[PDB]
């Protein structure tokens, strides 16, 4: 499946939500000892920029799943 490049951009309603979600997803990314395949991501204002570079489809599905679901949890709690 050669290389699996993937770019995800998520624009959040506030500049604060983007920080809170970044800060919570960061702490995971900074850990995540098992390294499925490279995922450098940064916060650009209200937006979050994710840039996965994976080895197979399982690695892609896994990375994308984790990172967006972490965003989901962060957003869920953030609006409770």
């Amino acid at each position: 499946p050669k290389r699996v490049q993937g770019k995800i951009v998520i624009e959040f309603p506030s500049e604060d939500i983007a920080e809170v979600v970044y800060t919570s997803v960061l702490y995971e990314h900074v850990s995540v000892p098992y390294r499925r395949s490279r995922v450098n991501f940064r916060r650009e204002g209200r937006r979050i920029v994710l840039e996965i570079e994976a080895n197979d489809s399982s690695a892609m599905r896994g990375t994308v799943n984790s990172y967006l679901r972490w965003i989901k949890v962060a957003l869920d709690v953030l609006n409770i």
């Binding site: 499946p1 050669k2 290389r3 699996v4 490049q5 993937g6 770019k7 995800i8 951009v9 998520i10 624009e11 959040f12 309603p13 489809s57 399982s58 892609m60 599905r61 994308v64 799943n65 967006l68 679901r69 965003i71 989901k72 957003l75």
Partner: protein, 84 residues
């Protein structure tokens, strides 16, 4: 809730595998349901030897998370059949 511009690219050997997969995903694939297909702009297509996927989303991440989870899974079952 959110706006989401997503772009996935999958490198392959030849031009015919990229196509075999993009056809396998675009036509009669069941991993992604019709409701999610009819939700936001999902575009799967070959580009020589890579199978480019682009999505433009607006809504809650729940539907986004699932749409991609389902699509990469759909490419996965596609490579799994091709290479058997």
């Amino acid at each position: 809730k959110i706006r989401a511009k997503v772009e996935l690219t999958w490198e392959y050997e030849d031009e015919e595998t990229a196509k075999a997969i993009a056809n396998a995903v675009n036509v009669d694939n069941i991993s992604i349901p019709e409701k999610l297909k009819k939700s936001l702009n999902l575009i799967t297509f070959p580009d020589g030897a890579r199978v480019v996927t682009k999505v433009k989303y607006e809504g809650e991440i729940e539907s986004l998370v699932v749409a991609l989870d389902d699509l990469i899974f759909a490419i996965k079952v596609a490579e799994e059949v091709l290479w058997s």
